[PDB]
Amino acid sequence: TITYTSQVANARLGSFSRLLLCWRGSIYKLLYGEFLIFLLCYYIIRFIYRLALTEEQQLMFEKLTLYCDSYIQLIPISFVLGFYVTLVVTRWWNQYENLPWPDRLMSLVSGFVEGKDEQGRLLRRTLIRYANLGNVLILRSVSTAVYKRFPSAQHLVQAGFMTPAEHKQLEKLSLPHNMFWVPWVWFANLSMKAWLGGRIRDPILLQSLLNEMNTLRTQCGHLYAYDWISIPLVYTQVVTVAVYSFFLTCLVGRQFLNPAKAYPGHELDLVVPVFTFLQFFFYVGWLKVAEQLINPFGEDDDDFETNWIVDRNLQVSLLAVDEMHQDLPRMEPDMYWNKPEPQPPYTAASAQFRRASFMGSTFNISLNKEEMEFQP
Amino acid sequence: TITYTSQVANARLGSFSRLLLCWRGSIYKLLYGEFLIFLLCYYIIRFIYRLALTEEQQLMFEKLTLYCDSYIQLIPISFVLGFYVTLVVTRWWNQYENLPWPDRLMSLVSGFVEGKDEQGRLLRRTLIRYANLGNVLILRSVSTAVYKRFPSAQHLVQAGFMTPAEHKQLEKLSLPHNMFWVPWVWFANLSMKAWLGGRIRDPILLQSLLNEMNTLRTQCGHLYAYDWISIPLVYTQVVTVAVYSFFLTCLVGRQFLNPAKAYPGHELDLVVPVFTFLQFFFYVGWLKVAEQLINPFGEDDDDFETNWIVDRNLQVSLLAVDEMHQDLPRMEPDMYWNKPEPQPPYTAASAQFRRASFMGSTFNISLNKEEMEFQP
Amino acid sequence: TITYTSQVANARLGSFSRLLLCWRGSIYKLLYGEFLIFLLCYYIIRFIYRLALTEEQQLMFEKLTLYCDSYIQLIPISFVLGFYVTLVVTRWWNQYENLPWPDRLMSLVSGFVEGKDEQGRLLRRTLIRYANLGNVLILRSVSTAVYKRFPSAQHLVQAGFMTPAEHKQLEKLSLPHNMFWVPWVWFANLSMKAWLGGRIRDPILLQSLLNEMNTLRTQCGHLYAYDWISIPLVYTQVVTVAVYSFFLTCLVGRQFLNPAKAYPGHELDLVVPVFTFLQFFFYVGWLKVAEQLINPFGEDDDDFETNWIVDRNLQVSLLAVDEMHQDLPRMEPDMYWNKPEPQPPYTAASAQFRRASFMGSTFNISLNKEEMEFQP
Amino acid sequence: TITYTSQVANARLGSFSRLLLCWRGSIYKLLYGEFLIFLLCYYIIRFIYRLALTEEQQLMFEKLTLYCDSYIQLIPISFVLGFYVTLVVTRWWNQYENLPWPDRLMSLVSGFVEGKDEQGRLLRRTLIRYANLGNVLILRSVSTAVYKRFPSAQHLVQAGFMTPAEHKQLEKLSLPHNMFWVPWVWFANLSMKAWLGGRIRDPILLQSLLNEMNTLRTQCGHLYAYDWISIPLVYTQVVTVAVYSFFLTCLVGRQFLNPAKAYPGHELDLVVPVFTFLQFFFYVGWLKVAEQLINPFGEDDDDFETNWIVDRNLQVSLLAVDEMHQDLPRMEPDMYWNKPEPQPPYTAASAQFRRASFMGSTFNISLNKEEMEFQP
Amino acid sequence: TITYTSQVANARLGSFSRLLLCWRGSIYKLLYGEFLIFLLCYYIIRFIYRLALTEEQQLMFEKLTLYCDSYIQLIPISFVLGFYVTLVVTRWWNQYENLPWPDRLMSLVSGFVEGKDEQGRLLRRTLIRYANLGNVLILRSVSTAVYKRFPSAQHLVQAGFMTPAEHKQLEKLSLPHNMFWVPWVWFANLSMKAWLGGRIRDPILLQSLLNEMNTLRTQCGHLYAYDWISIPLVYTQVVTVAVYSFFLTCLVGRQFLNPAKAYPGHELDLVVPVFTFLQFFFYVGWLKVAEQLINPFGEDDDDFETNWIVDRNLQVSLLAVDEMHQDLPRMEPDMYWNKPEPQPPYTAASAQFRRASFMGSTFNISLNKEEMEFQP
Ligand SMILES: [Ca+2]
Ligand SMILES: [Ca+2]
Ligand SMILES: [Ca+2]
Ligand SMILES: [Ca+2]
Ligand SMILES: [Ca+2]
Numbered sequence A, B, C, D, E: 001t002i003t004y005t006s007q008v009a010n011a012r013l014g015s016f017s018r019l020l021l022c023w024r025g026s027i028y029k030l031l032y033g034e035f036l037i038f039l040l041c042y043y044i045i046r047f048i049y050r051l052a053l054t055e056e057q058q059l060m061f062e063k064l065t066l067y068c069d070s071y072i073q074l075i076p077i078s079f080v081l082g083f084y085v086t087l088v089v090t091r092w093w094n095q096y097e098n099l100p101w102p103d104r105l106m107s108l109v110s111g112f113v114e115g116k117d118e119q120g121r122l123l124r125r126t127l128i129r130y131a132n133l134g135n136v137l138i139l140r141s142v143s144t145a146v147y148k149r150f151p152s153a154q155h156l157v158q159a160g161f162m163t164p165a166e167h168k169q170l171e172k173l174s175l176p177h178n179m180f181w182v183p184w185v186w187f188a189n190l191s192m193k194a195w196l197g198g199r200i201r202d203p204i205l206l207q208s209l210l211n212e213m214n215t216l217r218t219q220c221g222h223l224y225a226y227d228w229i230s231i232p233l234v235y236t237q238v239v240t241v242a243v244y245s246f247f248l249t250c251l252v253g254r255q256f257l258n259p260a261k262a263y264p265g266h267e268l269d270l271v272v273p274v275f276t277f278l279q280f281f282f283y284v285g286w287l288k289v290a291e292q293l294i295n296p297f298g299e300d301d302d303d304f305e306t307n308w309i310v311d312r313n314l315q316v317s318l319l320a321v322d323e324m325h326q327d328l329p330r331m332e333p334d335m336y337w338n339k340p341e342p343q344p345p346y347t348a349a350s351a352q353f354r355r356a357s358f359m360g361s362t363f364n365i366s367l368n369k370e371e372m373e374f375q376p
Helices: A015-021 A027-051 A055-070 A072-097 A103-111 A118-142 A144-149 A153-158 A164-173 A182-194 A203-228 A233-253 A274-293 A306-322 B017-021 B027-052 B055-070 B075-097 B103-112 B119-144 B144-149 B152-160 B163-175 B182-196 B201-228 B232-255 B275-293 B306-322 C026-051 C055-071 C075-097 C103-112 C118-142 C144-149 C153-158 C166-172 C184-198 C203-228 C233-253 C274-293 C307-320 D017-020 D029-051 D055-074 D077-097 D103-110 D118-142 D144-149 D153-159 D164-173 D180-194 D203-228 D232-254 D275-293 D306-322 E027-050 E056-066 E074-098 E105-111 E120-143 E144-149 E154-159 E164-173 E182-196 E203-228 E235-254 E275-295 E308-324
Strands: none
Touching: A015 B027, A015 E164, A015 E235, A027 A233, A027 A274, A027 B055, A072 A203, A072 A233, A072 B075, A072 B275, A072 E074, A103 A118, A103 A203, A103 A274, A103 E182, A103 E203, A118 A144, A118 A153, A118 A203, A118 A306, A144 A306, A144 D118, A153 A164, A164 A182, A182 A203, A182 B103, A182 D118, A203 B103, A203 B201, A203 C144, A233 A274, A233 B017, A233 B027, A233 D029, A233 E144, A274 B119, A274 E074, A274 E120, A274 E235, A306 C144, B027 B055, B027 B232, B027 B275, B027 C055, B055 B232, B055 E105, B075 B201, B075 B275, B075 C075, B075 C274, B103 B119, B103 B163, B103 B201, B103 B306, B103 C184, B103 D144, B119 B144, B119 B152, B119 B182, B119 B306, B144 B306, B152 B163, B152 E154, B163 B182, B163 D029, B163 D203, B182 B201, B201 C103, B201 C166, B232 B275, B232 C026, B232 C233, B232 C274, B232 D029, B232 E154, B306 C153, B306 E308, C026 C233, C055 C233, C055 D275, C075 C203, C075 C274, C075 D077, C075 D275, C103 C118, C103 C307, C103 E275, C118 C144, C118 C153, C118 C184, C118 C203, C118 C307, C144 C307, C153 C166, C166 C184, C184 C203, C184 D103, C184 E120, C203 D203, C233 C274, C233 D017, C233 D029, C233 D275, C274 D017, C274 E235, D017 E182, D029 D232, D055 D232, D055 E275, D077 D203, D103 D118, D118 D153, D118 D180, D144 D306, D144 E182, D153 D164, D164 D180, D180 D203, D180 E105, D203 D275, D203 E105, D203 E235, D232 D275, D232 E275, E027 E275, E056 E235, E074 E275, E105 E203, E120 E154, E120 E182, E120 E203, E120 E275, E120 E308, E144 E308, E164 E182, E182 E203, E235 E275
C-alpha cells in the first residue's frame, strides 16, 4: 500500500504533477520492462527496414506501414479498458471491505465475558484468539505474503496463533476442503459453554457476541469467494488482446518512413516516436492498474498489508480483551461540567476553520408579511 | 470456474500476456467455431470476387466494397457492448453472492441445540439437513449440472438429501409451484418444537436460528428470481444484432480489392485481413463474455461449481452440527499469556513484509510553537 | 416475463443467434410499426426527389442531402441512450426486488403462532391474509394486470382476498390517500393481541414477526415510490428528441443521390439504405428497451407476472400457516448417520462435474527450507 | 412530481413520442427562455452580418464562421453532460430514498403502546407527533416549499405540528445549530417513561420502537447531509461552461453565409437552423435535467411533493396510532377455509394473464435412462 | 464546503450560468496558475515560431504542427477522466457517509442510562464523551484541519475532550498503532459496569447501546481505511499523464500556422486559441474536481467542515445526555385531538403546493361492465 493522502490533501499547483516523481508503486516501475521490450522491437524493425531492405522491399514496407497506421482505433481500447479497470477497482475495494477486523467483537468480548480471574482471562483470550485464528487461516489461504509467513499449520502453532491442542483438533477434523471455518464453530461452542457456566450473564449478550462473530465469518467467506471466483478469463484475455494488438500494430504503423518519398503523413523523419511512447505509457499503465489490482493480496507495492493487519489485529484484540477488561480511567466531571454550551478552543493554525453552523438552504429565504399569513 | 489468482498475484512482466496461453475457459475455446465460419464465408466471397465475376461485375463489387467499408462504425457497437457486458457481469456477481452457505446457521445450530444424546444428534442433523435440502432444491431448479445430478426427488432421496418420509410429505404438500420453500417452514416448525422441548434454552437463540435460516431463504429466493427474470430479450437481441451486423458488413467491406485498379485505401493485396480478424476476436470475445456469464449455472468452464458447493456444504454442515458440537480443543494459556505486545515471528521469505503501522495522513504535519498555541 | 435461461445456459455456437428467432417480447414485435413508418417516409422522400423535383430543385436537394450528413453523429446519441437505459434497467431490477414475498413472514407465523385448534388456525390465517391483502392492495395500485383483475374493493372481497368485515372497516377508515398501509397496522395490532392472549409465547417472537411485516411494508412503500416518482419527463424527452432528431436527419442525409453527379460518397445507388436500416433497428431497439422496462408492471411480454405472483403467494402462505403448522416429517437418522465424510453419488450425466476442492490461490506456492525458517 | 407511469405502462407505437406533447415538467417549459435568448442573438448576428458589414468585413465574418464550424467539435459536451447527469440523478434518487415515512414506527406504536383510555391516547399521539415534528423540522430546513408553508416555529405551532410547551422547550434548549434532532431525544425519553410506567410491556418492544425511530433519524440526517454538501461547484461550473460555450460558438458558426460565395456547406440559405435548434434542445435539456434534479426539494414540476408528504404522514400516523389502536375487523374464517389450493377468479379483462407457474430453467431438460443412473 | 443548494433550488433561467460568478471553490481559483503557465508556454512557442527561425525551420515546424494536430484525440482522455472522476466522487461521498454522528447513540444513552443524580450525570456524560473522543481521535488522524486544531493529546486534554486520567490510561496502553479504537472498548466496559450497577435496567437496552457504539466504530474504521488505502497511484499517474500528454501535444498542434500557406485547417489566424483554451478549461477542471475531492479532509474550499462537525457533535451530545435526560415538554392533547382528518393550513406563499393525493397509476383505467365481471 502506497499512501499519498497527505500529499493530495489540498488541490495546489501541480498537485498531481508532483506525484509523477514517485517510484514505488508507480507507472514506471510497473511497465519499464514492457516499454524496454517495445522500444527494442520498434528500433530493431526501424533498422531492419532502413538497412536490410532493397528498394522494392522498402516500397512494400511503406505501403504496409501506411495501411497499418490507417487501421488503428482507440475507441475499442478505451471502452474495454475503462470498463474492465472499473470492474477491477470495484472488486479491489470490495476485497478490502471484506478484510475482517476484530474491533467490534473484541469490545463485545471484553465487556460481556466476565471474570478478572485466570478462568475469565483464559476464556476471553481464547475467544479472541479463535477469531484471530479464523482470520489468519483465510488470510494465509488468499494472500501470498501471509502464506509465505505461515507456510504451514506448524508455522501457525510456532507463531502462537494456534496451540498444539487446536492443531491436533484441526488435524482430526480435517476434510478435503479449506478448514478456515472451524474456528467459528469453536467460538460458538465456547460462547455457549461460557453462557451455561455463568461467565456470560445473558442470552442477549450471547446473541450479540455470535452476531459479531458471524459478521466476521461472512467477511472471511467473501474473501474466499473473491480468491476462488476470478474475473472471467475470457474478459481478461479480451482486454489483454486489445491492448497488446494495438501496440503490435503500432510497431509497424508508427514507423518514420523515408522523407524522400514525401508521403503525406511522413514528411519529417524524427527518430523517437514520442507520441507513440506517450500512448504506450497511457494505455499500458491503464492495463497495469488492473494487473496490479486484480489480485490485491499479492506482493505488489499497492497490494494490501495483510501481515501488518494480522499483527495489529492480534496485538490490539489481545490487549482489549485482557488488559483493558473492566479497567477504566477514573470517572470524574469533565471540563464542561456546568457549561451548557461548551466551546473547545482553537489554535493559531486552526482559528480560520471556525465556521458558523449550516442551518439549511432555506434559512435565507425572505417572505413578506402577507405571504407568511396562513389562509383560512 | 477457472482460477488464475495465483498467476496474477503480482503485476509482473507480461502478466496478462501469459494468460493468453490458456485453453479452458478461453476466448479461443469460446469463439473458434464462429471464427471458422467467418473465415470460410470471407474467403468464399474473396474467391467469388476474384474468379466468378466479370469485369463490370467486379467493378460493381469494388464500388460496393468501398461503400460498405465507408459504412462500418465501431462507436455504436462498443457502447452497447460495454453497457450490456457491464450489466451481465453485475448480475453474474450478484448471482454468486446469492449462493447460500450454511456456515453461520450451522455454527448457530451446533451452539444452540443442546444434547449430546441420540435425540440431540438427530435434531441438529435434521435442522442442518433441512437447510441443505432447501439449498439443493433451489440449486437443482436453477442449475443444469445439479439437475443432471439429481433429475428427480427420488434421486434426491437416493443421494441422502431427503428421507422417504420427507419425500412423502413433499408429495402430500405438492402445489403447482416450485416447492423449494417447504424446508424453511419445516425448519421453523422443528426449531419451535425443539425450543418447546427444552433443547433450545431461549427464544433469543431461537430467533437467531430463524434469522439465519431466513437469510438463507432470501438468498434462495434471489437465485430463483435471477433464474426466472432473464435480462430483457430485446436488449440481448439488440446487442446480438449490433455485433452480427458489424461483422456481416465486414465480410464485404474488408475484402482485398484488386491492386490493379489502385484504389485510395488498398494499394496492396494481402490474403489475410489481420486487423479485421483482430477486431473479430475482440468484439466477438466481448460478446462471448456475456454469452458465458448470462447463465452462470450452466456447464461452461467459467460457470459456478454448484455440485462441489453442494457436496462441501453437506459435509461441513453435518460435521459442524454433529461431531463439533460441544467438542472444543483444551483451553490453556497461549504463547503470549504474559506478553504485553505479542510479536509473531517472520520467516526469511516474509521478512521484507514487516511494516511500521500507518498512523494517519496528518502524522507528519509540522507546526511551530506559536502555531500550536491555543487561542482565547 | 420471457425466460430464455435454459437456452443460454451454455455459451455454444450461435447462442445469442438462436435468440433472434423469437417473436414474443422481441425487437421485431416492439418496433415493426415504427420501422414501417420510417420506411414509408424515407421512400416518399426518395420518390419525390426522383420524380417530382425538377433539375434545379434536384440540385438543391442534393446540396441539402450532402449538407445533412455532417450532422448525423452517433457519439452523443449512444452516450445518452446508454446512460438512460442503464438507469431504466437499474430501476427495473430494483422494482422487481421490491416485490413482496411472504415466505419469511409465513414461516415465522407458522412457527410462532401456537394452537392447532380453530382459534389458532383462524389467527394464523388472518395474519397471513393481512400480509397478502396489503401486498395485493399495493400491486393493484401499481400494476395494470392486477387492477384489471381487481378493479374494485368489492372485487377484492369477491375474490376472497378481503372479508366483508374488512371491507367495511377499510371504508370506515378511508382517507384521501391510498389505503394500502392499513393491513400492516391491522397485523401489528392482531399480533399484539395474540401475544397478550398467550398464542405467541414470547415478545422476542412477536418482535421477529413485526420485523418481517415491516420489511414487507418497506417493500410495498418502495413499489409505491417507483410507481409515483417517474423518471424525469425532461430526461425521457431528451432521449426521445435525440433519437428522433438523429433518424429524421437520416431521412434526408441517407437518400441515395444521383450517382452521375459523382459526389464523394454517392457512387453506388442501392434502393435500400441497409446501413441506415441497421442503425434504426439498433438505436430504436435500444430505446424500446427503456420503453418496455420504464413501467415493468404493464402488459408487455417482458413485464412482471404480478397475477401469478399474487396467486402463488396466497396459496403458499395459506398452506404454510394452516396445514404445515407443526406438521413435520418423521425425524429419523439420515443416510450418513455415522459416516464422517458423506459423499453423495453422481449420475452418468454429472460424473464429469466432480471437482477437487479449491484450497486457495497460495496452496501451490513453493518454498525452500531456508525460506520457511522463522527468524529471531 | 410529474407522473406518466400509466402513459408508459406498455411499449406501444410512439410511446415516448406521445410524451413530447406534455408541457408541465417538460423540456420546452424548462429551456424556452434560453432558447428565446439564443434565437434572438442568432438572428441579431445574422442581420448584422447581412446588412452592416462591408465586403471585407463580410469576408472576415465568413472566415470566422467557417473556423468556428470546423472547430466546434472540440467540446466534450456529451461526455461531460453524461458523466455529470448520471451523478445528479443518482443523488436525486438517494435523496428521495432518504425521505422519512412514519409507517413502520406508527404500526409499532399502535401495537405496543397500550391503553384505550385518554392517557394511552395522549401517549401514542405524542410519540407519533414527535416523529412527525422531527420530519417536518428537517423538511422545512431543506425544502423551499415546506419553509414557505412554515416560515417559523410559530407557524409550526399554529399548524398544530408543535405545541406551545414544545416551542418553549425548544427555545430553552436553543443552540446555535439546527434543532431538528431534539424530537428524537424527546421520543426516546418518552418511550423510556412509558415503559417504566407500564404502558410498554417489554424492553424488547421498547427496543423495536427505538430502532424504528433511529432509522427515521438516520434518514433525516441523510437529508440534512444532502442539503449541506452540494455537488462540487467546480464540477458544476465545468459542465455549465462546456454547455454554454458550445451554443455561444454556434451563434457564429451556424450562421447562413451568403450563398453567392458558394461555400462548401453554405450553398443554400435556409434561414432557420433546424439542426442547430435540435442540438440546442438535446444539449440544453440534458443540462436542464441536472439543473432541475440538483435540488429535488425546490419548486420545480419534477421536485418532490414535500407538502403533500407532510400532510399525508401526519394524517395517516395520527389515524393509525389513535383510531386504529386495538381496533381490528372481526376475525372469521375466510372464503378458502377448507380449500387446500385456493384459486381466486379472473375477470374477462384479466383472463389472459393466468399463467403456468415457472418451475426453473432446468425443468425441461431431457435425459436418457442410462444418463440418470447413479454411479458407484 | 461550498453550498449553493438555495441558489439551485429551481431550474430558473441561467440557473447554472449564475454560478459562474463565484470565486470560492471555483474552477478559476483551482486552475488559474496552471492556465497561466500554459499560456506562457504556448505564446513562447508562438513567438519562437513566428520570429525566431529561418524559413526552412518554419516549414519544419509547420509540418510538425500538422502532424501533432492529428494525435490529440478527445475520446481516450474523456473516458479516462470520466471513470477516474466517477470513482473519486463515489469515494468522496462514501467518506462523508462514514463521518460518525452521535445522535442515535446520544438518544439511546439519554433514554436508557437512568438517574437524575450526580452519578447518573457522570455516567451519561462519560459515555457520550467516550464516543466523542473516539470520533475526535479518528478525525485528527485523517483531517488536516482537525490535526492543526489538536496537534497533540495534551491539546485534546486542554480542549476538554480527554481528561488527564484518560490521557494517562492511553499512555499506559500505548501500542505502536493508532489508538482511536480505545474509547470504544472503554465504552463497552463502562456500559457493562452501568448495567451491573443497575443504572441500565435491561440487557436488551445494553445491547442497543453497544450496537449504536459499534456502528460508530465501523464508521471510524471506514474513515481510517479511506485515509490509509489511497486510490492506486498508478491509476492517478495514468490519468495525470493522459491530461498532460494531451495538453503538451496541443502546445504544438494548436499553433496558428501562417495563413499564407493556405493549409487545410489554418485559413485564419486568431492569435488566441480560444477552443484550445476551452478544452484546457474543461479537462483540467475535470482533473481539478478529482484533485480536490481525492482527499476531502484537507483544507480545500469544498472539503468537509470537520472542526464544525466536532464542535456541534460535542455540544449536541452533551446537551442531549445531560440537560434533556427525562426532561420532556408537558404532554397535552394536540390541535387535532378529535379531528379525524387533520388539515394543517397553508400560507399564501405555499397555497399553490396543495395537491391531491396520488392514488396509483392504475386509478384512471376505464373498464366496461362486461370486462369487470369475474369468470368461473
Ligand atoms: Ca496484486
Ligand atoms: Ca453459462
Ligand atoms: Ca412495461
Ligand atoms: Ca429543483
Ligand atoms: Ca482536498
